[model samples]
Target: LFNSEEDVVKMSPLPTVENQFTPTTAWSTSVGSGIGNFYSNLHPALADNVVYAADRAGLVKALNADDGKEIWSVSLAEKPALLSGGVTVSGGHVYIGSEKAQVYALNTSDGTVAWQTKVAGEALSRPVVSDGLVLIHTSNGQLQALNEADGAVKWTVNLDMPSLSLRGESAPTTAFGAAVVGGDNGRVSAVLMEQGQMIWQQRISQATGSTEIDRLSDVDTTPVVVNGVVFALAYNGNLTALDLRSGQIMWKRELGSVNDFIVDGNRIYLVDQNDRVMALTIDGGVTLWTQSDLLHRLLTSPVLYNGNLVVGDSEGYLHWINVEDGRFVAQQKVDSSGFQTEPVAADGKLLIQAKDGTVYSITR
Candidate 1:
């Protein structure tokens, strides 16, 4: 029925730079299988002078941020644990999700399990914690709240799930005492933090296209709340800004991205499916600039750091582009293992974890 494209996803040649500045790796250490079977970030979380990294085999390590020294390490589960999504540290606990539908909370100091709970689906997203509580969004259409003092479920809300959805979870956002999350059906919903009641649900993306895969419009991006506005992007749909109080669409633009949009000041930054990084005005969703030199490169989502747009590719190369014009300002290869998630920036350093469980600390 379709043309000769075989659903091919190809990687572009690693782009050469005119004046490439080799990034300085302050330290590097192996944490634990970062790139599990899939649907995992095993992302590094920083809290209280410690950086936490995990592997799919359930090895979680807390390292000293000033230097790459292991402070503590613990294996939460056996091999094939499939530690999906990212690590979260809140209130002296390190929380991680896994494919086994298990959520773990570890004591930040001793790296011991504070508590663990079995959920209905994959807790493949970072838990949102606030006001002495934690909110976790599972892959199988469940949003759960728990008391942070102990791993006890407080409220659970089940949303509608499409027959098909993306491989990962969009960690829920919080604002105005509500849990705002994008659903598998390409909609954004807000639920009360107190009782998990529905405040609003808006379709950020509508079904389109002839083929089924072409109609995939999952809003997997984590909602960005700012200045009473909610910004979200869907996989095959629109980049939209909404009013936080009323759930009304303020502006919508024809852009698609599965990754969450980053906000710096009044501008929004996102990397499209084809490896294009863009800057858009938050007022009306205007594209101020578009950079597509690295198209089809299997690029990780872009992260904002020190006035630069940073992203990594499948070749294990981290590319730093100029914030103003998207020109290549710097690049570095952390390892040949590649990046499964976007680089995490904190404490004046970029902590990039390669797919094989190696975390590289790079300084500006």
Candidate 2:
């Protein structure tokens, strides 16, 4: 309402970078109308040489990873299933969640429904399959673990939800006999995978202002684990590293983001809320470099490909930045419909899904 007007005009236009190498598209495919201008976590899932993707409606497809060949496709409901949590592939099944509070499991061989069950609220995040359990984080602040062989309720852990929160949920990350998830209450909790019991919880931010906007602190970022350290972030809170064994904070830095981030080697690459991409040291929260040229562009979470850090922007341009320095290696417009989810990579090929539901496989 004030300087914010001028701030919009100050957004940096696309910067020019020298041509290091142009990424070549190997193949392209579609999956219905895509997510289409909605708030979603719908991204492609790859496993066992098959790529699985879903749309906002009920359409789900399994395509060959090598070439754009359709293996199978299915519709969940007669009406729109409102698939939002995205597609997850594991244990010979493709798992998906819907906004209508449904969790479905389809056979990977053929897109037939194995089972579908009802949850408390919308399941708006990817289903994590681990240790014979399908873990889903629902919009109602509940983490329900279902039997992988069949859709049976194993255990459910309910976290406190803030009255006002964002539209997404942090998908749980599991390792070392535990599952860790972030919450809308600006906290992260560790749950025992065997019994779904609460191990420990740590706060990343505290709601500390008079207005709701000023006090917004949602820990919606999916917690990333590496070498027994849990790294998580909040919307208007802190980027924290904690001991995976105990929910003890090791270090923290003032960085807020909702997008997913990548932790490779000793470097953590993230796109902040303001759309600034950065690299930081993992041992200590030290900023190596910040690239603000793409500010306000609604950049997707960064992906690593061919030793370059790649990010897709709202303009449908994929920018490849050098990992050593924050310089642009190359940029190319792959789709004009734009991207809200990060690209998936496997076997030297990058899989990108546009907002209009087109998937492109690219390789350098």
Candidate 3:
């Protein structure tokens, strides 16, 4: 928000912090000339002894899990492809979406195109594959399920979109024949895994702000299923917990966030909209501790790694905090280009992806 260009010019530089633990790098390699201009939520997908990642420039490669060797590479778009969403591997195929409005599935063995089908909108989030279904959540607020055998359309459910919202979408979490997802209206819904039938819908927030822009309640974060409960957050709304079998709200807190959260046993960690890190108890929705030192700094969602909270920043630095009390214990600068996604855990190390298509595997 600004009155004029003069108000923007008065802004200060981004903040920095003192070094904590000296980070160690296992392997550092560039993917292909990274996703340059076209922004994406594409994170590295690791599975079946392989790591798959794609660049906006149209190159996707599968790397060795043990070592950072290129196992297979393929070009999905020869004419400047905008691979927006990340990669997903299931049923011996790798899946991803492009700004070209295409969903490409590749053979995991050789990176060969098994099938490339067009979808309704840009596949803005990573597709989740489970129960013979490839569930894709799109930018136009539609969730479609494709056949795992040959990428054939099975069913689709159109969702309501907010007029003004953030550039993100929730990745579907499939479990027990249900595709559980969060919608742009600050509501969570579950559709049948057999067909695209709405099973249950529950609102997480109510619009109360003055203007259309102020009443935003986009729930872009992927709702997590812990034990038998559901936990999700909204951009301009609340963090709610519900029962998995029934869409009954157990509790909620006035916390607004779009990024995904991590739940470990009875503890949950969240990165709020203002870049504040919070720890909350799962059973009662109680606040455990709040870490607001990284205010104004763009941060990725927190991940639990080796008993520490691992998160990346816009400056390509990974900050590690004590999961018990939110204390800064370790930090590392992976690259100068910055990070757009959080680090992925593979084997026992963390895979960090830089904005410039650089991939780094860090281990303590």
Best by lDDT: 2
Which of candidates 2 and 3 is the stronger one according to lDDT?
2
Q: Write candidate 1's Cα lDDT for 212-310 as tens digits.
A: 786788777789899788898998878988888788888788865666578887988888878888888887877788877777776786888888888
Please give the ranking of all candidate structures by TM-score, highest first, separated by commas.
2, 1, 3
Off by over 4 Å in 2: 1-10
lDDT, model 3? 0.80
TM of each candidate vs. truth: 0.94, 0.95, 0.93
Candidate 2 lDDT over 263-290, as tens digits, reads: 8878998878788888889887778988
Task: Sum up the clashes in candidate 1.
Answer: 0
State which candidate has the highest TM-score. Answer: 2
Candidate 3, residue 154: Cα displacement in angstroms equals 0.5
Location of the lowest summed lDDT over 10 successive residues in candidate 3: 7-16
Evaluate residue 91 in candidate 2 and report its C-alpha lDDT on the 0 to 100 scale: 73
Kindly provide the TM-score of model 3 when superposed on the true structure, using C-alpha atoms.
Answer: 0.93
- What is residue 237's positional error in candidate 1, in angstroms? 1.0
> Model 2 — which ten-residue stretch has the worst lDDT?
2-11
